[PDB]
Design a protein around this ligand. Structure first.
Ligand code: WED
Length: 133
């Protein structure tokens, strides 16, 4: 019941500062422009200890499955090959990605009827707000 309030199908309804986040991560111009148009569906499910997060989008479809606290390989929507670890901290899913000596942290939280995704790279934050589909 660990992630019950996250489970479901969610649709992006607003974004702030995403272009700058992507720049900070190292995403190139064309990818930033195409990725920034997308309005993804995020589908979160749990089966036993395994959490699955899918992103269905006109840009890229992605899928990760993981156990909390257990590192895994991830290929991100912008084609970084990263090592990821996701934990639950005070009810927030905290996702750290490491690659090439760099790090970014993605927090996913339930706030009212929304699922808020906060993406941080050094000093740069982007906030992505999802609602139930
Ligand atoms: O789409 C989102 O709302 C969230 C997201 O799918 C997971 C968290 C990180 C940002 C984003 C992935 C992502 C990362 C770099 C370049 C383009 C993209 Cl699309």
């Amino acid at each position: 019941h660990m992630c019950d309030a996250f489970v479901g199908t969610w649709k992006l309804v607003s974004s702030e500062n995403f272009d700058d986040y992507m720049k900070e991560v190292g995403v190139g111009f064309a990818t930033r422009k195409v990725a920034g148009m997308a309005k993804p569906n995020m589908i979160i499910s749990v089966n036993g200890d395994v959490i699955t997060i899918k992103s269905e989008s006109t840009f890229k479809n992605t899928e990760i499955s993981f156990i909390l606290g257990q590192e895994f390989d991830e290929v991100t929507a912008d084609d970084r090959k990263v090592k990821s670890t996701i934990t639950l901290d005070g009810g927030v899913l905290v996702h750290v990605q490491k690659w090439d000596g760099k790090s970014t942290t993605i927090k996913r939280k339930r706030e009212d009827d929304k699922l808020v995704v906060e993406c941080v790279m050094k000093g740069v934050t982007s906030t992505r707000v999802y609602e139930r589909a």
